[PDB]
Structure formats: structure tokens, C-alpha cells
Amino acid sequence: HQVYLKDMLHLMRYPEPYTHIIDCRTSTQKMHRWVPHSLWLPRDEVEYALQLSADEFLDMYG
Amino acid sequence: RLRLSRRTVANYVGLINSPEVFDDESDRPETRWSQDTFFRECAYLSEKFLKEKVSNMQQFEAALKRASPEAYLAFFDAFQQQTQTQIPLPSPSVWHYEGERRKQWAEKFISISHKAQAFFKDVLSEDVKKYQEVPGKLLQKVKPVLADVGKILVKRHERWLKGRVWTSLTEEEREAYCMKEVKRQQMQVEDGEFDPMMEDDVDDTELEEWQREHDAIMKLMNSPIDGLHFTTLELWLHTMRCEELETEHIYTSARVRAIQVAARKKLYDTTSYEEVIQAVVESIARGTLDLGAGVLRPHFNEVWCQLNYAKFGSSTITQHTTTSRRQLLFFHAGSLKDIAATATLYYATKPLSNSLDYASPYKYRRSLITLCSNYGVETAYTTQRPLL
Amino acid sequence: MLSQNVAKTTVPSYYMIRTNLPHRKPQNQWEGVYYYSGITKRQRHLILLHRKREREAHMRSFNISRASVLQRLEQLSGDRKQESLPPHVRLDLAVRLAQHGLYQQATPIVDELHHQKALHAGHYALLINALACPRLGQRILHCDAQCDPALTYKLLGDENGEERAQEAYRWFDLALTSLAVDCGHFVPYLPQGTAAASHITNALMRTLLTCGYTHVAAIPDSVYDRMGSMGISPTISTYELVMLALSLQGNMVEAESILSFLRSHHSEHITVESFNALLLGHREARQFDCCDAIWQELVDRRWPRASPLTAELYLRSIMDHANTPTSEPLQSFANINVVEKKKVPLVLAQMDELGVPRTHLSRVLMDEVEDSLRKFQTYRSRFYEWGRAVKQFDFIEFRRRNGWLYDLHLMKCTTKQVGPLRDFNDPDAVQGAVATAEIPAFFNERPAWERPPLEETLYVTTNKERYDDVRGGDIYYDDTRGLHDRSPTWMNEVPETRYDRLYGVNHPDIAKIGIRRHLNVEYVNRKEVVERDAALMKKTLSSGRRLRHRVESSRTHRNAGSLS
Amino acid sequence: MFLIHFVHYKTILQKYTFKFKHIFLSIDKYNSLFFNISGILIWLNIIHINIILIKYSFFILINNFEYLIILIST
Amino acid sequence: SFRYTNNLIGALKHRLLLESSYREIASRKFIGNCRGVEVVCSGYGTVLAVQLTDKAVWESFYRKTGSLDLDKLAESIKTALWDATRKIRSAKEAALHRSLSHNTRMRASADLKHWYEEDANTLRPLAFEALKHEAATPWMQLVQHGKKEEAAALLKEFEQKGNREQPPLASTLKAEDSNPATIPIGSVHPLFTPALVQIEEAGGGSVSNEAVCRAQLWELSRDEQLFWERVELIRKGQVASIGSSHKRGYADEAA
């Protein structure tokens, strides 16, 4: 399901505690800014990442 | 974090063979500058681009402050580490400003900072040597001048004011005055004139009064103080305007100008104009003079912090590292004390300066870490303050 | 694009010429004519918006009239001042206040009137009736209760119902006192005997309906018993209020009993409002066949005359019926109870025979009814034209743009066949199909414990046709892949990761390759902690015993050894 | 700043259950009555008879689509 | 999506209505009566007056020459008080009910428990809290209900110039403060008052954009830097373990 630009600006100014904005950008060479309240799981790692336990995931992605 | 900046250390990360203790070459006091990795890189890149051979950190930064616009630009084009500690700080506008803007900035700035460096190497060095025994004396000599410049400035602000109190004005007029004052500061930085004539007053009554004032001020600036060889205008030109030109991207940009306006406005709201001028006078008059790396280093009053809020507190900030060249948005100064902390770290960690030990890589590391732990503690205080 | 858009014709060949295979489906006798009953998004939106605006209009009216009464109060309190207004002015004010639900402000006024003995018989009945807030009732009925009369009672109960009740009881007693004064042969039963007493009691009941559940429940129990005890004879409206109470409670047996008694002894006095009571009641108990029985009866005796309220209650009960689901056993094909809506165009016809104007029906109900109509009603005009192929195929096109082709006859191609059941009475007997029917797959489908767990979610299945020539066997197969399926070569097909050096390792220490241990200054590893504590609960079983030292038992004393 | 360390309660209770049948549970299939075939007659170019079981035939099907076929007691 | 903001808006609609109700009931009279005896309570449940209506009628009921019952009299006082109190409690619950029946977001989560989780015992005004709210000075009442404007005003005028029937709060709390529009955010949810007070303006009851933006901007700064720290480390781990800075594409990046 989509989320539009409006939703994005709204969530920039008015974050929800349990909504997570997850940055999928793969190459660090191309990413110069930070989408507010986001977190970084690069696409290439996802299949692995999502199979970690809560603890292990905490250790790998911080 | 200092460790993780370096290649060596970063090749133990995310491996199953890693030596958990995690020491580095610079953590052992015996090590010499030639065995150091980061410096090996700097040395290599100084040969290739700067075209100088360098065995010390000292010689290196010395070499880089000598360089020529092409050599400088080529170097910082091949050089990816602006920030070792990743503590957000201002930086020379080399790391902002892509392309043509970059090239022409460097062309202006390096000429100017060469002139300044010469000025420091002799004219100031002698006068700092004379008064070495009692600190503060040198700038106390300059205080009585700035006082009078201040009185004139105040008088001008007042004749603009025309008897109506600053708080009674509409926010439109106030914002207009502030925008004026900030544009004025921009012209001061770019054109190197202490009191530039501005388009805002074209008035003949104003041209006469403002000419009387401009001339009283330029007369006081240009007039030699007796104990010291250097003129006040030279001090402002080489110690201040130079450094504010190093960061020029803060004046050049319209966004940042807007932030600066808001800050001026908030400052004049709480404080009278006489007190703000007097406070600036004191921010220079107390001061510190570093022989190494120029930089007259201010006292960090609440007023100084508010005037400089855009530079140390806003998102003007940019970090280049091996991994990423990024730009902090949302970087913020909670309080003024926060700013004082950041600016302290900024001036102290400036290239070769009295607060860093260039003797050995170990001593260097220690000096830097001491400064960062310092900054950190001020930051923790600032965190607890509003609530406690 | 759309995966229900599917070849209905075979590849052109001489097999269409040389064979008696039919070129189209035979018509399906039990599939209804497709026709148009339904509304747009836009239309639904228009109705909702419009409805909202009428709601606002009413709420505005109520605010204006309330504000007006309150201004009259402030003016009569302050401007009249020391000079005492005549009793009738105050009394009118009290009534008007209470009617908008400001009882609080009416209380002191009423007290002061009763103290001056300015109230007489009917005046009390007037006040007590005003406590039922029926200017507030109007507002609630239109906005909140969405025009349903039963809901309006229930919701009115939430406006300070307990205090209004208590006030009603109090004023009722005030009234009985005043009456006994005014009457002063029949000296002993003179106060209870008087019609005024009956009137007042009715007022009390009529108000208690408007308060909460508790009080509504108290009408047919205590109030009516107390009325019998007191000696006050009831009127038809007494009985209809008791019925309305019983019926809000959903107590049908007793409501119907009261009506029976009335029918038998008092028949010529029965108003419509007892039938209204019963209708409302049966609808609450959700007995719709009774809701029907009572309406049909009321059409047979054509007197008393049905009122627009009656027609409204009956119609509502029908919509209610039509929207209830059945249990799962009856839900496999469709929602049955929709058939009830098809009663509606009959009821509407009766309303014209009866002289009930159909335009007194709430906007709300008339929306539901108009919908019900457009489902089942059509005229002889439309009927001559409704089967044209253009309209049938247009309906198909509409279904295609909304991607629902599943049910349509022309437009679906059934593929799967269901094989026969074997017998252990013989493998030998070769079965063959006598007849064939298309019936939904849920009749016979492999029992849920035999088939893999949730199929829709964990498996992606597509029924498709073999491209190659199939000598024998089925021309369709099920291509089923798992949702999670991946190339066995996947790790080469994807960029390298920092995970790769963990290859073929059952329990990696992800704590070691992880970034948290460098990032954090303190770094507690959660898995060393638990190791340490299991290591500590090992030491509790590592207890050895120290050698004890027995002494010598004697009969006469205890022996004391000391360290030597 | 941080004043406290806490343990994260959450109410995960599922107490409601909504399961909706996917569409393909209600799709049609072709079902058939099935009796034991006692015999078969095919004719297209040349007639052929197969007799599996000889009994009095209680039912008879005729089917014309490609070849004429007659399924006896089918 | 937006489950949290929406559920929150629902819950705060509920709170505002319970609060507005508290302020209505708090300043108001409730009269219990038993036999000739009128007990008058404030919304806080505090007995204001004990009167005898119609001495003419009721006096000989208690005797008086007769000696007083004091038993009959006690029972009727007790009963009157109970009646009044029960009116108060019912008013509270009523408020709750109107709120629940009109609040559609709270209706969305289907909870019978919404109807029982706050009842007369639970809602405000609380009886055992009467004293501290009623015995309070007009100034104190002003600040208690979060009107900082009128409290400051009253304070300056305080410095510079240096059986009754009415609830003690009908002075401070007037009609217009029943409007849920007026209720300051500090006061809305009393349970959390000390935390929600910092969202509020230093002088004004209304929320301060400046304070809230300051608070957010601080955290955003911190969290930005954290983000880049983690990115840095994850990248360095990639380059370390892989051995080079290059990676394959995907099988689909050939086209």
C-alpha cells in the first residue's frame, strides 16, 4: 500500500511512536541527507536482517 | 570513534577473527609519525598534489597553509577526511560550495589568508612576545578604541531609532532592520570594508550624518595605538574577517541569512543595543591570541553566542568522511552554553594550535581526546540543565 | 492485464466445422436478468453531505430557541427585579425552560410558585409534562437518534435523566398535596377520585419514559402499582404509557397482555398509540414476524387510523430484518434476509390505500426505502426493455472494469472437474458420468485436515493450460509455487553481504560481527549475563556437606563437647 | 535526559477473530453423477461395440459431439 | 496507517468532554430532600446547608410541647444527604454516557469496557478531594484550573492594593469554562498534569509552538547523528567482510 508525499511531510512534523520510517537506499556513496526519524536497513541485507532474532537484529543494525 | 575513522581499525569490524581489545598504532606512545596510517595518507597526498615532502604532522599542516589555490583544491579533491571525530563543527567552505563557486572562493580566500598569515608571522608575533608575561594586556590595549567605535555605532542606531523604543516597533520594521544589519555583515565579510556604505540609506541628510560617522569610525580604526605597531583595522581585517571568510558559505546563502536574522531579532528583543555593542567589545577585548594558526579567539559571551548562533547552532553543517559526504539538517544548539562548547572545540581543534600536541601521534591523540571529552561534558550539562 | 479475461473460443480450425460441439453456452435458466440497482460513490457522498447539512439546520434552530429562553430568563430575573411578575409569566418561563432541558433553572421557579399557592390542578400536569424535554427531544430525534423514535427515548435518558426523574417525583407529590387542598361527598376518596389526579399521574409516567432504563422499568412496576394502591383510576393513555414502557424493556408478553385486556373490556377507547407501542416493542425484541402480524391486523381493522409514526415503525422494523445476517450454515451462497426488503413496495401500496402520506417518513428511512425500491420495483414500461442485450453486456462491462467476473454466466469458463469416488466393493467396475452440473467447490473440497495449512497465504497458485501438445491426461494443471520460494543459486544472484562469511554455520555469534559492540561505550552482551547466572545456579548444587560430630546419648542429660 | 529504566509492557491480546474466505473457495467445478458403465457403442466411420457387463439396462445416454457414442446403463 | 494519531484524537475528545463535565458539576448545587429536610451539597459532595422547608408542615412530624425525635430527624438528614450525593454521581455518569454514545473513534475499537472503566467512583469531581479545591482561595482555584491569565491578574491586584447558598467554585468556574474549547492542555488529562504542563506556554493556557518545536528539534539533532554513526559502521563492516568496496548487481540489472 502506498504512502504519499503529504503523509511523509505530516510524519516529519508529527511522528508516531510506533511508526517506523525505514531507509532502503543501498549505496552510501549516493546518500547525503537523512530522512527525519528514519533508520537504515539497506535493501541488499533485508532477506538476512528479517530472519535475525530481536537481539541479533539489535546488534547488527543498532 | 577516533579509531574507527582510520582504515586499520575499520578492517577489524564485522569479522569473526577480530582482536576484541582493539588497540591502534597511535595508542602506543613509542610510535613515530612515520608509522602512523592517517599521516602516511596525508604525506602521500601532499607529495602527489601539494608537491611537498613532509615527515611530521606539523610540517604537513604548515605545508597545507602555504599552498596555492590549484594545489589546495586538488588536494581537498583527493582528500576525503574532513572530520576524524565526527563531532559536528563548522568547516572551511571548501567542503560546501561545489564546482565553479568552489574554485573562485578558494582563489579569493587563499590570497587573503596568505596576507593574514604573513601579518601573524611578524607584526603580531612581536607584540605578543612583548606582553607575554601578563595575558590579556595586548587586547586590553585595543579595548579603548573599540569602546569609541561602539559609542558612534550606538549613536547611529539611535538616530535611526528616532526616539521610539525598540519594543514598541512592529515586527515588520524590526525584521527589516535586522535583515539590513545582516546584509551589512555580509558586505563586511565579502568586501573587507569595516563599514561599507549600503543601499538602504541613500538619503542626503543620512549621507551627511552617516559620512560624519563613517569617517569618525574609519579615523579611529586607522589611528595607531601607541604600545602596538599594528592598526586596529588590520586586527579586524586579519583576525576576524579572515576567519568569517573561511566559512563564507554562511553569509552567501539566503536560508542561513534568514536564520541569522531571526537570531538578531531575538537578541535585540531581550537586550538593549548599548549592552550588545559593549558585550561584543568585551568579546574581543578579553580574547586570546594564538600565534599558531592565526585566530583571535573570542570570550564567548551570551551575546557573542547569540550573534554567532547561525554558524555553530544551525544546520549549516557538513561532514565528509571516507564512507559518506553528508549534510546535517536538524543540527541544533539547545542552549547558548552549547554553542560556547562547540565554538571552543572548533577553535581549539583548528590546525596547528596551542591546544594540540604535534610532538608524537600518541600525544596528538591525547590532546584531541581531551578536547572532545571536554566538549562532551559541557554537552551533558546542557542536557540536564533545563529539567534539573 | 485482467486475469479473468480469458479465451472463450478455441483456436480457429476445421474442428468447429466437422463436429457437433456447440459454439456458445446454452442459456442458464436460473440466472436472473442483469439489471441496474446501485448507486455511485458520488451519489452516496451527496446523500451523506446533504443529510449532514439538514442535521446542522436543526441543531442551529435548537440553539436559537434555547438562547432565546435563556435571555428571557436573565431579563425576567434582572430587569423585572423587585416588582413581582404575575404567576402566569413565571409559570410559562418555567415550562419553556424545562422543555429545552434546563430543569435546573426551572426548579427554583416552580418551588417559589408552589409556596405561593399559584399553581392549581392542570398547571402541575403542565410542569411535569415539561420535564420530559420535548424541545430537546426534537433535536435529539433529528440529529442523534437519526429519526428513530425508540432511540430517542433511550438517548434522552442520558441527559441528566436521574435528576429529571427525581424532580418529576417531587413535583408529583407537590401536586397531590395541592389537589387535596383544592378539593377541600366522597371526602375520603375525593383527591384520588378526581380526574385531575389521573391526569397528573399520567404526566409523571410520560416523563419517566424519558429518563434512564431504571425509571422506564419502574413505570409498569411501582408507579402503576402505587396508582392502584392510591386509588387513582387510569385512562387509555395510562395503559398506553405502561405498554410503551414494557415494550422499551422488550417485554412483549406483558405488553400484549395489557392490549388483550383492553380489547376485551375497553375496546372502543383504544387509540393507535397502543399499536405503536407494540410495534416499537416487537422491533426491539427483534421479533419481526410479530411486527408484521400487528401491522396486517391494523390494516384489517381500519380503525384506529394508522399514523405516519406507525408506518415509520413498521418500515424500520422491515429494514432491520433485511440487514440481519444468518449463521454460517446459511451464508454460503448469499445473504438471504435481503428478501425482506422486497415486502416494501407492497407496504407502500397499502399506505396509499390507508391514506398515510408517504412523505411523512424520516429523510433517513426514506433513503433506505428508496434504496429498497430500486432493488425490487420496476414498472411494466421498463420490463419490456430490460432484457436487451446491450444492457446485459453493459452490465458485464461494468463488472469487468471492477474486476469481478466470477459469477457472470457468459463470462466465466469453468475448468476443474471433480472425479468420482472409488468403492472397495470393486476396483473393476468402470464408472462413467451420467450427468454434469456446475456447482460451487465448497460442496466437496478436500477436508481441511488433509490439505496443507493456509493455502491462500503461503502458496501462490495459478490454474493454467499446457502449451505443449498433451497426448492424454488433463489440458489444465495447477502451477503452485510457495510464497517463499527462491532460486537454489540465490546467493550468487544477489550482491554480496556482510553476512557471507557466516556461510553454513548453525549458531553464529552475530554479537561479534555486529556493530553494536563498537557503537556502545558500555556494551552489555545479553548472552554472557545468562551464562553467568546459570553458572551461579550450578554452584548451589556443588554444595558438599561438612562432617558433623555426633555426641553420646544419655538418658539423664546432654553431653557438651568443646573444641580442644 | 533519562531518569529511568523500564520493561515495556504491551497488550498483544487477539481476543477478536476475523477470517474471510478467499474468493476461490466458492468458484464452480464440474460435478457428475456416476454409475457403472455396462456397455458402450461408438460409431463414426465404422461401428464398434464394447460390452462390459450384460444386464437389463436401466438407463441410456446418447452423445453426438465428435463421434456418435451410446453409453449403456451408464 | 495513522492508527496512533487517530486513536489519540478519539481519546482526547473523550477527555475534553469529561473535563468540561467536571467543571460543570463542580460549580453547581444538588438538593436532596427526605421529609421536610433539604440537604444542599456542592458538586464536590460537600454539605453546604441543612434546612427544613415548610416548618409549618413538617415541624410537628419531629414533635418539637413534644420533645424532638432526633431519630426520625437523623434518618431523614442521612437520607436527604444520600439523595443529593446520588444525584451528583448520576450527573457524572451521565456526562460519561453522552460522551461515549457520540464518540465514534472510541466506538471503532469495540469495547464494552469503555462503559465500565470509568464510573461515579472514578470520575471527577472526587469527594475526598473536596477540601483542597473548595477551601482554596479564589487565586488558588484559578491556578488549580489552569487559568494563568486571570490568576496573574488577580495576583497583581492583590499586591498593588496591599449558611450561604452557592458552591465555593461557582465564583472561579463560570459558564464559559464548560466549553471544551477553553480547557488548557495542562488541565485536560489530570493524571498526567505535571508532564503536559511543559507543552504549555509560560503565561498562556494554550500550547506553545516554540517549546514543542524546541523539544522536537533537540531529539532530531541527536537522532540524525546516531543515524550517521550506524550507517558509517554498517558500511565499514561491509567493506571489511567483503574485502572490496564493489558489489555484484542483481541478475536483473543486466537489462
Q: What are phi and psi of D51, to 5 degrees?
A: -120, 110
With CA atoms as reference, report the closest residue to C18 among D63, D71, D62, D64: D64
Are residues B342 and B323 in contact, defined by beta-carbon separation less than 8 angstroms?
no
Are residues E53 and E38 in contact, defined by beta-carbon separation less than 8 angstroms?
yes
Q: Which residues pair with D34 in a beta bridge?
A: C433
d(Cα E178, Cα E28) in Å, to the nearest integer? 12
Return the CA Rg of chain C.
41
Coil/strand/helix, residue C485: coil
Which runs of consecutive H residues, i.e. helices, occur in C17-120? 41-78, 87-99, 103-115
d(Cα E112, Cα E121) in Å, to the nearest integer? 18
Q: What chain B residue is nearest to E243 in terms of C-alpha separation?
A: B11
| CA dihedral over B19, B20, B26, B28, signed as positive or negative | negative
Cis peptide upstream of residue C304 (ω within 30 degrees of 0): yes
Phi-psi region of E2 (alpha: psi -120 to 50; beta: other; left: phi over 0): left
Coil/strand/helix, residue C349: helix
Interface partners of C (3+ CB pairs, < 8 Å)? A, B, D, E
The minimum CA-CA distance between B192 and chain E, rounded to whole Å, is 34
Q: Which residues pair with E38 in a beta bridge?
A: E33, E51
Q: Which residues pair with E68 in a beta bridge?
A: none
What the block records as the C-alpha cell of C229 is: 394502591
Q: What are phi and psi of B79, to 5 degrees?
A: -100, 120
What the block records as the C-alpha cell of B134 is: 601578563
What the block records as the C-alpha cell of A43 is: 535493501
Secondary element (H or E) of residue C459: strand C459-465
Cα–Cα separations (whole angstroms), residue B222 to B50, B233, B243: 37, 6, 21
Q: What chain A residue is nearest to B320 in terms of C-alpha separation?
A: A32
Q: Which residue is listed with cell 463535565? A: E21
Tell whether E236 is within 8 A of chain A (Cβ): no
Cα–Cα separations (whole angstroms), residue C5 to B70, C397, C432, D14, E181: 68, 11, 32, 39, 57
Q: What are phi and psi of C449, to 5 degrees?
A: -85, -15
Are residues B91 and B342 in contact, defined by beta-carbon separation less than 8 angstroms?
no
Are residues B87 and B372 in contact, defined by beta-carbon separation less than 8 angstroms?
yes
End-to-end CA distance of chain B: 30
The minimum CA-CA distance between E215 and chain A, rounded to whole Å, is 12
Tell whether E210 is within 8 A of chain B (Cβ): no
With CA atoms as reference, report the closest residue to B311 among B265, B352, B342: B342
What the block records as the C-alpha cell of C319 is: 429494514
Sort out which chain A residues have CB atoms less than 8 A from C510's CB and list them: 52, 56, 59-60
Q: Give the distance, in angstroms, between the CA of residue B109 and the centroid of all CA atoms in the same chain.
A: 14
Cα–Cα separations (whole angstroms), residue E58 to C38, E32, E34, E35, E52: 71, 16, 11, 7, 8
Interface partners of D (3+ CB pairs, < 8 Å)? B, C
What the block records as the C-alpha cell of C183 is: 378539593
d(Cα B373, Cα C4) in Å, to the nearest integer? 68
Coil/strand/helix, residue C252: helix
Q: What are phi and psi of C317, to 5 degrees?
A: -55, -40
| CA dihedral over B350, B351, B357, B361, signed as positive or negative | positive
| CA dihedral over E113, E117, E120, E123, signed as positive or negative | negative
Q: How many residues does chain E have?
A: 255
CB atoms within 10 A of CB B142: 21
Tell whether D7 is within 8 A of chain B (Cβ): no
Tell whether A30 is within 8 A of chain B (Cβ): no
Cα–Cα separations (whole angstroms), residue C128 to C65, C103, C158, C171, C190: 21, 11, 18, 7, 22
DSSP letters for E178-218: SSTTT--HHHHSGGGHHHHTTTB-SSSSSB-HHHHHHHHHH
Bridge-based pairing of strands A38-40 and A21-23 is parallel
d(Cα A45, Cα A26) in Å, to the nearest integer? 9
Coil/strand/helix, residue C131: coil
CB atoms within 10 A of CB B363: 14
With CA atoms as reference, report the closest residue to B198 among B189, B207, E59, B330: B207
End-to-end CA distance of chain D: 87
Nearest neighbour of A3 by CB, restricted to E1, E229, E231: E1
CB atoms within 10 A of CB C504: 4
d(Cα C412, Cα D29) in Å, to the nearest integer? 11
Nearest neighbour of E230 by CB, restricted to C158, C161, C515: C515
d(Cα E170, Cα E24) in Å, to the nearest integer? 9
Task: Kindly provide the resolution of this structure in angstroms, with one decimal.
Answer: 3.1
Are residues C167 and C128 in contact, defined by beta-carbon separation less than 8 angstroms?
no
Q: How many CA atoms lie within 13 A of B332 on its CB side?
A: 17
Nearest neighbour of B16 by CB, restricted to C513, C515, C518: C513
Phi-psi region of B249 (alpha: psi -120 to 50; beta: other; left: phi over 0): alpha
Q: State the DSSP code for E165.
A: -
Secondary element (H or E) of residue B58: helix B57-66
| CA dihedral over B273, B279, B284, B285, signed as positive or negative | positive
Cis peptide upstream of residue A15 (ω within 30 degrees of 0): no
Are residues C495 and A44 in contact, defined by beta-carbon separation less than 8 angstroms?
yes
Q: Which residue is listed with cell 510464497? A: C483
With CA atoms as reference, report the closest residue to C297 among C350, C355, C251, C352: C350
d(Cα B364, Cα B355) in Å, to the nearest integer? 10
What the block records as the C-alpha cell of E43 is: 458538586
Which runs of consecutive H residues, i.e. helices, occur in D3-69? none
d(Cα C429, Cα D34) in Å, to the nearest integer? 11
Secondary element (H or E) of residue D68: strand D68-72
d(Cα C452, Cα C455) in Å, to the nearest integer? 7
With CA atoms as reference, report the closest residue to E133 among E92, E171, E180: E171
Put simply, the answer to whether B16 touches C501 (Cβ < 8 Å) is: yes
With CA atoms as reference, report the closest residue to A39 among A54, A60, A13: A60
Are residues B250 and B311 in contact, defined by beta-carbon separation less than 8 angstroms?
yes
Interface partners of B (3+ CB pairs, < 8 Å)? A, C, D, E
Q: How many CA atoms lie within 13 A of B177 on its CB side?
A: 19
Phi-psi region of C120 (alpha: psi -120 to 50; beta: other; left: phi over 0): beta
d(Cα A59, Cα E169) in Å, to the nearest integer? 58
Q: Which residue is listed with cell 542483481? A: E250
d(Cα A26, Cα C497) in Å, to the nearest integer? 11
d(Cα C219, Cα C206) in Å, to the nearest integer? 9
Are residues B324 and B301 in contact, defined by beta-carbon separation less than 8 angstroms?
no
Bridge-based pairing of strands B325-327 and C431-440 is unpaired
d(Cα A51, Cα A53) in Å, to the nearest integer? 7
Return the residue in B319, B330, B382 with the most chain E beta carbons within 10 A, the one to mutate for interface testing: B330
Return the CA Rg of chain A.
13
d(Cα C247, Cα C282) in Å, to the nearest integer? 7
With CA atoms as reference, report the closest residue to C175 among C130, C230, C117: C117
Work out the angle between the directed axes of helices C273-284 and C236-248 (0-180°, nearest 10): 10
Q: What are phi and psi of B23, to 5 degrees?
A: -75, 160
Are residues C252 and C287 in contact, defined by beta-carbon separation less than 8 angstroms?
yes
d(Cα C525, Cα B9) in Å, to the nearest integer? 21
Bridge-based pairing of strands B325-327 and B318-320 is antiparallel
Tell whether E251 is within 8 A of chain A (Cβ): no
Are residues A28 and A36 in contact, defined by beta-carbon separation less than 8 angstroms?
no
Phi-psi region of B284 (alpha: psi -120 to 50; beta: other; left: phi over 0): alpha
Tell whether C501 is within 8 A of chain E (Cβ): yes
What the block records as the C-alpha cell of E186 is: 495542562
With CA atoms as reference, report the closest residue to E226 among A37, C196, B195, C187: A37
d(Cα C251, Cα C256) in Å, to the nearest integer? 9
d(Cα D37, Cα D53) in Å, to the nearest integer? 8
Q: What share of chain C is helix, strand, coil (3-state, %, to 5)?
A: 55, 5, 40
d(Cα C155, Cα C161) in Å, to the nearest integer? 10
Q: Which residues of B205-221 are buried (b: 16+ CB within 10 A; e: fewer)?
A: eeeeebeebbeebeebb
DSSP letters for B68-102: -HHHHHHHHHH---S-SS-------GGGSS-HHHH
d(Cα C155, Cα B165) in Å, to the nearest integer? 61
> Which of 347-386 (B) contact D at CB < 8 A?
383-384
Q: Which residues pair with B318 in a beta bridge?
A: B327
Tell whether A27 is within 8 A of chain B (Cβ): no
Nearest neighbour of B330 by CB, restricted to E214, E220, E235: E220
Are residues C426 and C25 in contact, defined by beta-carbon separation less than 8 angstroms?
no
DSSP letters for A5-62: HHHHHHHHHS--TT--EEE----GGG--S--TTEEE--GGGHHHHTTS-HHHHHHHH-
Bridge-based pairing of strands D28-36 and D60-63 is unpaired
Return the residue in D23, D24, D27, D59 with the most chain C beta carbons within 10 A, the one to mutate for interface testing: D27
Cβ neighbours of residue A1 under 8 Å, at least 6 residues apart?
E1
d(Cα E200, Cα E193) in Å, to the nearest integer? 11
Are residues B339 and B309 in contact, defined by beta-carbon separation less than 8 angstroms?
yes
Nearest neighbour of E247 by CB, restricted to C107, C170, C496: C496
d(Cα C503, Cα E145) in Å, to the nearest integer? 65
Q: What chain D residue is nearest to B379 in terms of C-alpha separation?
A: D1
With CA atoms as reference, report the closest residue to E147 among E173, E126, E171: E173
